[PDB]
Amino acid sequence: LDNQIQEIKESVELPLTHPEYYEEMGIKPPKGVILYGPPGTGKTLLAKAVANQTSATFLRVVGSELIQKYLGDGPKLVRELFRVAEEHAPSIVFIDEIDAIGGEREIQRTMLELLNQLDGFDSRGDVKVIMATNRIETLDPALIRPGRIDRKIEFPLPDEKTKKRIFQIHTSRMTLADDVTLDDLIMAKDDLSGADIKAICTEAGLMALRER
Amino acid sequence: LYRPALEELRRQIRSSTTSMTSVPKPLKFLRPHYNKRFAADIISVLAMTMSGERECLKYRLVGAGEVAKEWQELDDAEKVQREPLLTLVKEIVPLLMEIEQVDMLEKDIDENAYAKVCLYLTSCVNYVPEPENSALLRCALGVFRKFSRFPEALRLALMLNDMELVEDIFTSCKDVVMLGRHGVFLELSEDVEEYEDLTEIMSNVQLNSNFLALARELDIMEPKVPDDIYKTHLENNRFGGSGSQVDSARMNLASSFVNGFVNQDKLLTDDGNKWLYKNKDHGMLSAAASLGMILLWDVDGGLTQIDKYLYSSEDYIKSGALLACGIVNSGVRNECDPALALLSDYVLHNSNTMRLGSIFGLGLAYNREDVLTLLLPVMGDSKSSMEVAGVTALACGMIAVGSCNGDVTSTILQTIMEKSETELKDTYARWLPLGLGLNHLGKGEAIEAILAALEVVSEPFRSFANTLVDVCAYAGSGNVLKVQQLLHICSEHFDSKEKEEDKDKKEKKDKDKKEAPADMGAHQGVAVLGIALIAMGEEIGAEMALRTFGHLLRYGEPTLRRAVPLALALISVSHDADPEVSYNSIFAARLAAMLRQLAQYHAKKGTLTLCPYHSDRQLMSQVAVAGLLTVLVSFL
């Protein structure tokens, strides 16, 4: 879909396309947007981030495991991504699977620190940050008012057409019987970025490969 | 009666279960006679392993016609099979390879050429010894001479260093009429020998006037410079800020590095005056030659821009001006007479510094004998300055690189006798073996390492010359005996033959960089950490190399902290300015600031790219070397 991809494309990919409307019209939205969808996990969100990879430098950060896997590191890796994003001003920062809130007392101070550093109290518009998660209700409203000031969009239920096409491509060379339907498979699964149905097609193609 | 059938069954069962020598005997006594599954079984794998173990046992045991007939039978059989994956590399070790390649190369070009020449050229320079690579180059000259895609035969000219290859590729590339591109990387690929032999045979015929018109000069830079000015647009904020934080008479030397090595824009070149007047003597050489480094083009403009500094009131302005005249061009050779004419001071007058800039500049411009006869009173003078014999040995060495298996003539023999004449100022014993090993370059089977190993066995000065000849005499082949010998001699008490002899690692294994990262940094011999630090900076600088620069970047001694931005800038020519900010976090001495600016503006097997830094490995001395540090030609 081009509709919800042109606004984020011009939003975070701004200084590489049509450079006569950012300063001539006087817009300057140096805050970006915040993405959220009940399937989430970066399937349609990564499908919205693939347009930035055409002619630009991309940075892929999925999940918050790299912050919660150390004793007391905290947001230091976020500061490294923000200084390499400062040195990479003509790039796109994509953060996916923000489920840190969903020990625990440090998550609130590293998320409030993420809010303070993401706002740029002593920095001008240099890099754009993209936020993505699975459930918008788990996130605290602190990340909303300072973070989102430009635009937010709601994402509907998942699309069975694209997942059915991916399962059809992955099961094109495979051998399936007549009693194996697709509606129960695409219906029973939920909250999968596509790499998970690719994962069950890899362990299903390998599991079918065990019998040669 | 039909005993060959019983021999076929016997070799079928002995080859069926296990054997090492009894398998091919019923076949060599059988004389086999009388696309199928059975033919692939008893021919493909049974004759592949069978003839392979026969060629191995007969190749390693004795050293007949039976193995040649069976080897050609397996060659034709695997030509019918058309799977040259293991068959080629199996039939390598049994010239036989010549008739093998010219017998197999009939229809398939990119398969045997790209695949066989790719994995067999890489594995031939990696594992296969030298005397077979010559057959690779001659038979590849044959099958590639009959085929298209000339630039791979030009790689065969880079590895062969032959005079007939450029003639055959210039008449074959002359018949098949890009042009300026193959001229540019043609001059880049050719060494010092075949472009002067090329300029003498093309001084004879030249076949269009376009071979010395095009491929002699002015046309490796006639496409680049105007297109480099057109297609690129550099900002002025680097000259402003990065060109404004210079001070302390050393960052101004780094600003002569700037001026010389940033030439689209020529603002800092003509930013008023007094910039050369406020500088120092060696900075007057660096700034007098900087305007020569900004003029790698516009031959007519070079004379009218450097003419103001020629024969001026200051000695370093005119000597560095002649150095500029040597840097601006390499085929004009018209500025020689006003400086090369006199040459006579005999103690310490101006023409000795003009001998530095003019002999070094002419060495950058250049078996030339007249300039060497003029260099006889140069080494015979024996001035107290080091850079005299420095640019003399390096100049005659760059004149002598790529020769026919080197030479032990009275030139380097003369500089060895006059080297051992007086044992003073050991820097002579450090930079004279540089030019010696430069004359050792180009060897294929030279015994100059043993001749020197017999002639300069003495105190560790000329024994350091001996290990330098050992460094330049082992450019690289399959000689792992020198790798275990490298590990054995690596623990020597002498802390300089470790530096150079262990520093040869970046030259020996420069291609197979998978084994280059080693545990040399984990030792306590910080000089070895400098060895690996210098050895890293020869590639794009992947995350592993920058990972080594993470630990090597943090040190307390000014020699290693000064040495890390050099290789950090050579390895990377948006992750460039981040390690620089890391240097700003480490420091905020003067050498580290001048060198970190040198990296700031340095960011933005050819001997020309191997000599200047191997000579640059002696920076830990007085600022006298800094007059030669800025004129390095290895920087593209």
Tell me if A75 is assigned to a ligand binding site. Answer: no
Dist CA B325 CA B320 (whole Å) = 9
**Contact between B577 and A88 using a beta-carbon 8 Å cutoff:** no
Interface subset of B 286-325, CB within 8 angstroms of A: none
Contact of A80 with chain B, judged by CB distance below 8 Å, is answered with: no
Dist CA B180 CA B218 (whole Å) = 11
* One-letter amino acid for residue A158 of the chain: P
| CB neighbours of residue B500 within 10 Å | 22
The angstrom resolution of this structure is 8.5
Method by which this entry was solved: cryo-EM
Per-residue tokens: B419: 């080297």
Dist CA B295 CA B293 (whole Å) = 5
Q: Enumerate the residues of chain B whose CB falls inside 8 A of the CB of residue A82.
A: none
Per-residue tokens: A44: 């349609």
Backbone φ/ψ region at A130: left (φ over 0), alpha (ψ -120 to 50), beta: beta
Chain B residue nearest residue A57, CA to CA: B574
Residue in A9, A13, A5, A6 with CA at minimum distance from that of residue A89: A13
Dist CA B490 CA B485 (whole Å) = 8
Dist CA B162 CA B164 (whole Å) = 6
Whose tokens are 């994003």? That residue is: A85
Contact of A87 with chain B, judged by CB distance below 8 Å, is answered with: yes
**Contact between B574 and A83 using a beta-carbon 8 Å cutoff:** no
Contact of B484 with chain A, judged by CB distance below 8 Å, is answered with: no
Dist CA A151 CA A44 (whole Å) = 18
Per-residue tokens: A134: 């699975």
| Half-sphere exposure of residue B229: CA atoms within 13 angstroms, side-chain side | 13
Contacts of B590 (CB under 8 A, 6+ apart): B248, B250
Dist CA B171 CA B166 (whole Å) = 9
| CB neighbours of residue B209 within 10 Å | 10
Contact of B575 with chain A, judged by CB distance below 8 Å, is answered with: yes
B437 and B472 Cβ atoms separated by less than 8 Å: yes
HEC-encoded secondary structure of B395-424: HHHHHHCCCCCCCCCHHHHHHHHCCCCCCC
Dist CA B216 CA A143 (whole Å) = 67
Tell me if A42 is assigned to a ligand binding site. Answer: yes
Dist CA A35 CA A45 (whole Å) = 7
Contact of A88 with chain B, judged by CB distance below 8 Å, is answered with: yes
C-alpha distance from residue B95 to each of B103, B138, B392 (Å): 12, 11, 44
Contacts of B164 (CB under 8 A, 6+ apart): none
Q: Which of B572, B574, B582 to mutate to test the interface with A (most CBs of A within 10 A)?
A: B574
Contact of A79 with chain B, judged by CB distance below 8 Å, is answered with: no
CA distance B17 to chain A (A): 29
Dist CA B466 CA B450 (whole Å) = 9
B361 and B333 Cβ atoms separated by less than 8 Å: no
| Half-sphere exposure of residue B368: CA atoms within 13 angstroms, side-chain side | 19
Strands A151-152 and A33-34: parallel
Chain B residue nearest residue A88, CA to CA: B574
Q: Enumerate the residues of chain B whose CB falls inside 8 A of the CB of residue A87.
A: 574-575, 577-578
Chain centre to alpha carbon of residue B573: 18
**Contact between B578 and A88 using a beta-carbon 8 Å cutoff:** no
Quote the strand ranges of B511-561, DSSP E.
none
C-alpha distance from residue B115 to each of B95, B108, B112, B123, B378 (Å): 21, 11, 5, 12, 52
B470 and B440 Cβ atoms separated by less than 8 Å: no
Residue in B169, B137, B136, B163 with CA at minimum distance from that of residue B150: B169
DSSP character for B216? T
Dist CA A9 CA A48 (whole Å) = 8
Dist CA B557 CA B543 (whole Å) = 25
B500 and B614 Cβ atoms separated by less than 8 Å: no
Question: Rounded to the nearest 10 degrees, what angle do helices B353-365 and B281-293 cross at?
Answer: 30
Chain B residue nearest residue A80, CA to CA: B578
Q: Enumerate the residues of chain A whose CB falls inside 8 A of the CB of residue B578.
A: 83-84, 87
HEC-encoded secondary structure of B335-362: CHHHHHCCCCCCCCCHHHHHHHHHHHHH
Tell me if A162 is assigned to a ligand binding site. Answer: no
B483 and B477 Cβ atoms separated by less than 8 Å: no
Residue in B357, B438, B433, B356 with CA at minimum distance from that of residue B396: B438
A74 and A113 Cβ atoms separated by less than 8 Å: yes
**Residue B89: burial class (beta carbons within 10 Å; 0-12, 13-18, 19+):** middle
Tell me if A38 is assigned to a ligand binding site. Answer: yes
**Residue B65: burial class (beta carbons within 10 Å; 0-12, 13-18, 19+):** exposed
Dist CA B527 CA B497 (whole Å) = 11
Residue in B411, B456, B399 with CA at minimum distance from that of residue B429: B456
Q: Enumerate the residues of chain B whose CB falls inside 8 A of the CB of residue A57.
A: 574
**Contact between B575 and A87 using a beta-carbon 8 Å cutoff:** yes
Interface subset of A 18-77, CB within 8 angstroms of B: 57
Contact of B578 with chain A, judged by CB distance below 8 Å, is answered with: yes
* One-letter amino acid for residue B413 of the chain: L
Per-residue tokens: B216: 């002699």
C-alpha distance from residue B599 to each of A83, B540, B604 (Å): 21, 15, 9
* One-letter amino acid for residue B279 of the chain: N
Chain A residue nearest residue B576, CA to CA: A87
Report the Cα–Cα distance between both ends of chain A, in Å, rounded.
Answer: 40
**Contact between B575 and A57 using a beta-carbon 8 Å cutoff:** no
Chain B residue nearest residue A91, CA to CA: B574
**Residue B5: burial class (beta carbons within 10 Å; 0-12, 13-18, 19+):** exposed
Please tell me whether residue B378 adopts helix, strand or coil conformation.
Answer: helix
**Contact between A57 and B574 using a beta-carbon 8 Å cutoff:** yes
**Contact between B574 and A88 using a beta-carbon 8 Å cutoff:** yes
B322 and B354 Cβ atoms separated by less than 8 Å: yes
Tell me if A103 is assigned to a ligand binding site. Answer: no
State phi, psi for B511 to the nearest 5 degrees. Answer: -90, -50
Residue in B210, B282, B295 with CA at minimum distance from that of residue B253: B282
Contact of A152 with chain B, judged by CB distance below 8 Å, is answered with: no
Dist CA B149 CA B413 (whole Å) = 43
Query: For chain B, what is the largest distance between any 2 Cα atoms, rounded to a whole number of angstroms?
Result: 105
Dist CA A67 CA A76 (whole Å) = 8
Dist CA B374 CA A122 (whole Å) = 66
Please tell me whether residue A3 adopts helix, strand or coil conformation.
Answer: helix
HEC-encoded secondary structure of A90-158: CEEEEEECCCCCCCCHHHHHHHHHHHHHHHCCCCCCCCCEEECCCCCCCCCHHHCCCCCCCEECCCCCC
A110 and A76 Cβ atoms separated by less than 8 Å: no
Contact of A84 with chain B, judged by CB distance below 8 Å, is answered with: yes
CA distance A52 to chain B (A): 17
Contact of B33 with chain A, judged by CB distance below 8 Å, is answered with: no
Tell me if A76 is assigned to a ligand binding site. Answer: no
| Half-sphere exposure of residue B449: CA atoms within 13 angstroms, side-chain side | 14
Chain centre to alpha carbon of residue B233: 31
Contacts of A206 (CB under 8 A, 6+ apart): none
Question: Rounded to the nearest 10 degrees, what angle do helices B251-261 and B590-603 cross at?
Answer: 20
Question: Rounded to the nearest 10 degrees, what angle do helices B428-439 and B410-417 cross at?
Answer: 170
